[PDB]
């Protein structure tokens, strides 16, 4: 429930890992000649960045996993129909369908385990850095509850990355890294602390916490990683059992040639082609491909209660039963059954900055709250002069106040702040998909072309795939038609 400083919403959501081979985000290596304070800040920043990345892609996209089931059913049914039309044996029909599931599951699982492996490899690289600098304690980077490294040998890591073989459905083996951590004491000591886990299971936990705590940030949470793992197992079990029930009831009665899907462009295929040539943001194209109810016809101007930030953009609900999002109404996403996704241009982000001191003493402007990353505070003085200050230029006083010296920017250095507002630092139109976590109010709902002001929202999605549906050509024709006109609406 933590994202862009300006919006409680989890930002930079990447759902592409459920539809394509996803490349992991690499580790940042700090310099040799560094100060303990600088190393601690750089390590804390890397942990925050890694957790934020993992939240947006794997960890916080739980309610879109029913879409993975939909994608897996589409792909397997097409493979099965081709075999049924060829007058093949029931085993050959199921073989083609399950080979499609095997390749799809391998991709989804490999992407998921690859991101865990990178998180765990990064921690080791960060641990090795702390060991080498010798000005920072291991208790800073590896804290599992009892970070007492008094009996651990010099130049030795308390971590061990164990190779664990995962049997991928396509017959191949994948090396999943099992994270083991031992503080160094003997079994018998009261201080003895050991943890060993991965997204699949907790091997051993002694005087330990699965998750790591670095500068107050809890990450590598087994409960978070295992939640996605157990849901992934559920989804692919349901597809395989469902396709078995489907073929058993469809074999013989559905005539060979009744359904012709050989040239069909699947919602998954449609979204992957968007990557080659992008006419819209990838995440909304992916959410459409996963059959998540979206509102393409309207444009909502939202305002965040706590922040004051206003944004125009398009909505997406994982559960359409979360009711219509009416204009003039205030909504708290913590109460909702599903997850709210908002796709909007970050450059347009704007809101009032009331947390500012009146006095401009010797050109110095002081603010009473942390400036938001990727935004600039536009300070207007009583002499009708304005100065744009990006967050990175605000110096922390450690008093809960931040200051900037505008002696080179203002004509009158000694003055009073008239008003202040925060605006985005983005040079161009930059689209982003956020998962709204904090309370928001829907200001206005603008129709897509005409510009009319509507009261409520209307979400649309194609027929969800079951173990007994997509028997008629009409069901399949509607799938391609409904999807291609949704993509057109965002272009
Ligand atoms: Br330094
Ligand atoms: Br597909
Ligand atoms: Br066919
Ligand atoms: Br890997
Ligand atoms: Br330390
Ligand atoms: Br120690
Ligand atoms: Br050990
Ligand atoms: Br000991
Ligand atoms: Br994480
Ligand atoms: Br946990
Ligand atoms: Br048949
Ligand atoms: Br819907
Ligand atoms: Br669905």
Q: What HEC string does the chain produce?
A: CCCCCCCCCECCCCCHHHCCCCCCCCCCCCCCCCCHHHHHHHHHHHHHHHHHHHHHHHHCCHHHCHHHHHHHHHHHHHHHHHHHHCCCCHHHHHHHHHHHHHHHHHHHHHHHHHHHHHHHHHHHHHHHHHHHHCCCCHHHHCCCCCCCCCCCCCCCCCEEEEEEEEECCCCCEEEEEEEEEECCCCECECCCCEEEECCCCEEEEECCCCCEEECCEEECCHHHHHHHHHHHHHHHHHHHHHHHHHHHHHCCCCCCCCCCCCCCCCHHHHHHHHHHCCCCCHHHHHHHHCCCCECCCEEEEEEECCCCCEEEEEEEECCHHHCCCCCCCEECCCCCCCCEEEEEEHHHCEEECCCECCEEECCEEEECCCCCCCEEEEEEECCCCEEEEEHHHCEECCCCCEEEECCCCCCCCCEEEEEEEEEECCCCCCEEEEEECCCEEEEEEEECCCCCECCCCCCECCCCCCCCCCCCHHHHHHHHHHHHHHHHHCC
Neighbours of ion ligand 3 (CB under 5 A): 82, 85, 262
Q: What spacing in Å lies between the alpha carbon of 67 and ligand 3's midpoint?
A: 24
Task: Round to whole Å and give the CA distance between 363 and 413.
Answer: 4
**21 exposure class (CB count in 10 Å sphere: 0-12, 13-18, 19+):** exposed
The C-alpha angle 384, 385, 391, rounded to 5 degrees, equals 130
Q: What spacing in Å lies between the alpha carbon of 36 and ligand 8's midpoint?
A: 29
How many other C-beta atoms lie within 10 A of the C-beta of residue 54? 21
* Helices 90-133, 36-54: inter-axial angle, 10-degree rounding: 170
In order of 23, 41, 461, the CA distances from 435 in angstroms are 22, 27, 19
Measured in whole angstroms, the distance separating CA 316 from the mean position of its chain's CA atoms is 15
How many other C-beta atoms lie within 10 A of the C-beta of residue 336? 17
- Quick check: 17 and 58 in contact, CB under 8 A? yes
Quote the tokens at residue 414. 């000694």
- Quick check: 336 and 33 in contact, CB under 8 A? no
What are phi and psi for residue 207, nearest 5 degrees?
A: 40, 45
Q: For 157-179, give one letter per residue: b (16+ CB within 10 A) or e.
A: bbbebeeeeeebbeeeeeebbbb
- Quick check: 169 and 106 in contact, CB under 8 A? yes
Task: Round to whole Å and give the CA distance between 420 and 454.
Answer: 32
**In 3D, which of 382, 301, 269, 216 has the Cα closest to residue 19?**
269
Measured in whole angstroms, the distance separating CA 115 from the mean position of its chain's CA atoms is 12
Measured in residues, the chain has a length of: 491
For 451-455, the CB contacts below 8 A with 24+ separation are 453/327, 454/298, 454/327, 455/326, 455/327
CB within 8 A of 99, min separation 6: which ones?
79
Q: What spacing in Å lies between the alpha carbon of 333 and ligand 10's midpoint?
A: 23
Q: What spacing in Å lies between the alpha carbon of 71 and ligand 3's midpoint?
A: 19
First-last CA distance in the chain: 31
Task: Round to whole Å and give the CA distance between 382 and 101.
Answer: 66
Question: Could you tell me which residues are beta bridge partners of residue 64?
Answer: none
Q: What spacing in Å lies between the alpha carbon of 36 and ligand 5's midpoint?
A: 8
Q: What spacing in Å lies between the alpha carbon of 94 and ligand 11's midpoint?
A: 12
Q: What spacing in Å lies between the alpha carbon of 73 and ligand 11's midpoint?
A: 19
Q: What spacing in Å lies between the alpha carbon of 40 and ligand 8's midpoint?
A: 28
**In 3D, which of 20, 112, 13 has the Cα closest to residue 71?**
20
**335 exposure class (CB count in 10 Å sphere: 0-12, 13-18, 19+):** exposed
Q: Which ligand lies nearest to the CA atom of residue 187 in the structure?
A: 8
Task: Round to whole Å and give the CA distance between 78 and 62.
Answer: 26
Task: Round to whole Å and give the CA distance between 301 and 311.
Answer: 5
Q: What does this entry list as its resolution, in Å? A: 2.7
* Helices 90-133, 66-85: inter-axial angle, 10-degree rounding: 140
How many other C-beta atoms lie within 10 A of the C-beta of residue 261? 19
Task: Round to whole Å and give the CA distance between 58 and 227.
Answer: 10
Q: For 212-231, give one letter per residue: b (16+ CB within 10 A) or e.
A: bbbeeeebbbbebbbebbee
- In the chain, how long is the greatest CA-to-CA distance? 87
Q: Is the dihedral of CA 320, 323, 325, 331 positive or negative?
A: negative
- What residues does each domain of the chain span? 293-457
Task: Round to whole Å and give the CA distance between 107 and 365.
Answer: 52
Task: Round to whole Å and give the CA distance between 179 and 430.
Answer: 37
Q: What spacing in Å lies between the alpha carbon of 127 and ligand 8's midpoint?
A: 22
Q: What experiment produced this structure?
A: X-ray
Q: What spacing in Å lies between the alpha carbon of 151 and ligand 8's midpoint?
A: 6
Q: What spacing in Å lies between the alpha carbon of 210 and ligand 10's midpoint?
A: 5
Q: What spacing in Å lies between the alpha carbon of 288 and ligand 12's midpoint?
A: 11
């Amino acid at each position: 429930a933590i994202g862009a400083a300006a919006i409680s919403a989890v930002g930079g959501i990447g759902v592409g890992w459920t539809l394509r081979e996803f490349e992991v985000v690499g580790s940042d290596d700090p310099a040799e000649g560094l100060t303990p304070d600088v190393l601690r800040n750089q390590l804390s920043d890397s942990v925050v960045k890694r957790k934020s990345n993992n939240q947006s892609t794997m960890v916080d996209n739980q309610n879109i996993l029913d879409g993975v089931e939909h994608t897996a059913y589409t792909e397997a049914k097409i493979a099965a129909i081709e075999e049924l039309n060829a007058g093949s044996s029931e085993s050959a029909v199921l073989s083609a369908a399950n080979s499609a599931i095997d390749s799809y599951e391998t991709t989804v699982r490999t992407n998921f385990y690859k991101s865990w492996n990178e998180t765990v490899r990064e921690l080791e690289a960060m641990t090795q850095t702390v060991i080498a600098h010798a000005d920072v304690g291991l208790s800073y980077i590896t804290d599992f509850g009892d970070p007492r490294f008094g009996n651990l040998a010099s130049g030795t890591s308390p971590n061990t990355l164990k190779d664990t073989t995962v049997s991928m459905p396509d017959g191949t083996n994948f090396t999943l890294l099992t994270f083991r951590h031992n503080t160094g004491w003997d079994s018998g000591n009261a201080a003895y602390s050991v943890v060993e886990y991965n997204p699949k299971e907790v091997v051993t936990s002694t005087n330990s916490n699965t998750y790591n705590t670095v500068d107050g940030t809890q990450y590598m949470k087994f409960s978070e990683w295992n939640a996605v793992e157990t849901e992934m197992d559920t989804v692919f079990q349901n597809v395989r059992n469902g396709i078995s029930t489907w073929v058993t009831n469809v074999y013989g009665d559905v005539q060979s040639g009744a359904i012709e899907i050989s040239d069909l462009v699947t919602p998954r295929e449609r979204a992957t082609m968007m990557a080659q040539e992008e006419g819209m943001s990838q995440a909304i194209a992916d959410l459409i491909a996963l059959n998540v109810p979206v509102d393409a016809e309207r444009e909502a101007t939202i305002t965040i209660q706590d922040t004051g930030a206003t944004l125009p953009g398009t909505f997406a609900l994982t559960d359409s039963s979360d009711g219509p999002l009416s204009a003039g109404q205030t909504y708290d996403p913590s109460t909702f059954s599903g997850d709210v996704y908002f796709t909007a241009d970050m450059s347009l982000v704007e809101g009032p900055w009331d947390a500012i001191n009146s006095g401009v003493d010797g050109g110095t402007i002081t603010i009473t709250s942390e400036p938001y990353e990727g935004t600039a505070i536009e300070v207007t003085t009583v002499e009708s002069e304005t100065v744009s200050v990006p967050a990175a230029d605000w110096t922390d006083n450690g008093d809960g106040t931040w200051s900037y010296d505008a002696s080179g920017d203002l004509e009158t250095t000694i003055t009073n702040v008239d008003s202040a507002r925060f605006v985005s630092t983005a040079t161009e139109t930059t689209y982003d998909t956020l998962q709204l976590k904090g309370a928001f109010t829907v200001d206005k709902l603008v129709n897509k072309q005409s510009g009319e002001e509507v009261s409520s929202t209307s979400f649309t999605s194609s027929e969800p795939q079951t173990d007994s549906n997509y028997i008629t050509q009409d069901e399949w024709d509607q799938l391609e038609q409904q999807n291609k006109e949704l993509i057109e609406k965002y272009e």
